[PDB]
Amino acid sequence: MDKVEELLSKNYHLENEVARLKKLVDDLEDELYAQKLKYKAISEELDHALNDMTS
Amino acid sequence: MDKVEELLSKNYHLENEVARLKKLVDDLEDELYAQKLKYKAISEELDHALNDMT
Numbered sequence: 001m002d003k004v005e006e007l008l009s010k011n012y013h014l015e016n017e018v019a020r021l022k023k024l025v026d027d028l029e030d031e032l033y034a035q036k037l038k039y040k041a042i043s044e045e046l047d048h049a050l051n052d053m054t055s
Numbered sequence: 056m057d058k059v060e061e062l063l064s065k066n067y068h069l070e071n072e073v074a075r076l077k078k079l080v081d082d083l084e085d086e087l088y089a090q091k092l093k094y095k096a097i098s099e100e101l102d103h104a105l106n107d108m109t
Binding site for chain 2: 001003004007008010011012014015017018021024025028029031035036039042052
């Protein structure tokens with residue numbers, strides 16, 4: 001029928017969205033952790049900075 | 056009546072999945088942004104720092 005026609009259509013668009021969101025969510029997960037490691041490393045040279053500047 | 060019912064159920068689960076993923080993306084974008092505001096605020100401090108001694 002037609003209620004089936006539109007449902008197939010709506011489900012097609014929905015499945016695509018879900019695909020794009022899952023990938024986006026993964027990309028952000030990585031970007032965010034990469035971010036945290038870059039932040040943690042930014043301090044590593046710093047721990048040696050104020051630490052070696054003190055004594 | 057058979058597939059029309061299957062279709063509706065799939066559709067329902069998809070709409071909820073989209074809404075949940077959408078909420079997840081928004082949270083990650085916030086965390087990420089917030090992290091950039093600290094990364095930045097910090098950098099601006101080295102400015103007064105590395106050159107402060109130059």
